[model samples]
Target chain A: MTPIVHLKGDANTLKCLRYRFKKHCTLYTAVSSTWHWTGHNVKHKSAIVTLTYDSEWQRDQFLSQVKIPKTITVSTGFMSI
Target chain B: MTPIVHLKGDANTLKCLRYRFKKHCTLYTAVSSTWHWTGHNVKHKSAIVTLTYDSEWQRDQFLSQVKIPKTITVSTGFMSI
Candidate 1:
């Protein structure tokens, strides 16, 4: 249990974030289940929706910019690797 | 044990195959470790190299097109998923 942040979004936004990570991050994976970010594999439980970010800062930044339901859960000590 | 095939190559080549699959396959993972193909998570050891294709037909086609070490080992009944 580390830290976890949840954000609700569509597949399109997830894909964009993934591409953004691809442009910056060296090692990452974005498929049907997990989206990798800074050693965290935030499992987005469904087929292309329900995304999560490892860092709260990143999650907030995403929420600030993107137009999604503002129902984010920031849980400390529940990080996924 | 299911069917497995091995082909030796550099990271660049593997990336190319991954992109090719991305254009065709629905879900795939092209990280530094396992390169998912079909349903098998081809766990490439110490990667950025050493790739494996789940299907023999796909492997042959790839070998026929790309230039890699001509040392492919196709083992039947040793599949990975």
Candidate 2:
């Protein structure tokens, strides 16, 4: 709904970002079925990938040019079964 | 939940997205736990993922179809010291 960032691409990169988002998430049994993207959890919102971007390299390139938080934004993925 | 496009599959693809997110993320050293996905930062909010459909290949198919942000959305990540 907001102005989304659309990077046009092909197949490989699309698959790459998909593979990435899935890997970093630490699944919790505390899912009441609704994710609150507000408060501190907003940091996790960066995982929503869209269509466009041709390959994983492009997706990676886009991410490499942004300014992100230095702590909690990159301090997730401590989940293990 | 906004109809999630889940492309289910083996843990392999799942792991890919996780690694990508982690790699692309700058590893912020703060802990306020709050992220703002508006303005320019909103440009970098396309990394969220979910589980739907019934396979990783299927999930991979979904991502390979849309657009992405330019500049920062796919930039930054110069933290390798």
Candidate 3:
């Protein structure tokens, strides 16, 4: 499984998150987002940005180097499972 | 902007979609899923798989070559915007 870091926040926060990592493309292999939806109307809500890395070290490096605002929550896990 | 395709379906259907495209990694650059959430409890609901490609042709090729079950819904767009 690939090491991954999840960033949960509003659209702008996530956009900045992507901008911060834009220069280091190799540090992570893929970036995806999960959009939250409401009831039957399927109303769109927030989104969680997921960054996937080739190795744990790459993931670790990203986590260590990046700084996110208090408004954004961060978590770690594996992807492509 | 990178070309992208969005696949909306249940967990199993999205998993199968991933499996079908696993052999052609270059056709798409990244694979990400967006999970649906409910009210304040933030309960999990479903996921929509996002496949990103380097070019529109690559994305078109993937769409043409892959066969998805009727249970899954497909759409197209761009990512990292």
Which numbered prediction scores highest in lDDT against the true structure? 3
CAPRI level of candidate 3: incorrect
Question: Per-residue lDDT of A1-81 in model 1, one digit per residue for the tens?
Answer: 222333334445555554444333322222223322211254543222223345546555654554444432222223222
Pairs that collide in candidate 3 are A34-B34
For model 2, residues B1-81, the per-residue Cα lDDT tens digits are: 112232223334344554443432332222121222222123332333332233435434434532232321221111111
If ranked by lDDT, best first, what sequence of candidates would result? 3, 1, 2
TM-score order of candidates, best first?
3, 1, 2
- The global Cα lDDT (0 to 1) of model 1 is 0.37
TM-score per prediction, in order, is 0.25, 0.19, 0.46
Full-model lDDT, candidate 2 = 0.29
The regions of model 1 sitting more than 4 angstroms off are: A1-81, B26-81
Candidate 2 residue runs with Cα over 4 Å from true position: A1-52, A72-81, B1-81
Residue-level lDDT for A2 in candidate 1: 22
Give the alpha-carbon lDDT of every model. 0.37, 0.29, 0.62
In model 1 chain A, the worst 10-residue window by lDDT is A30-39
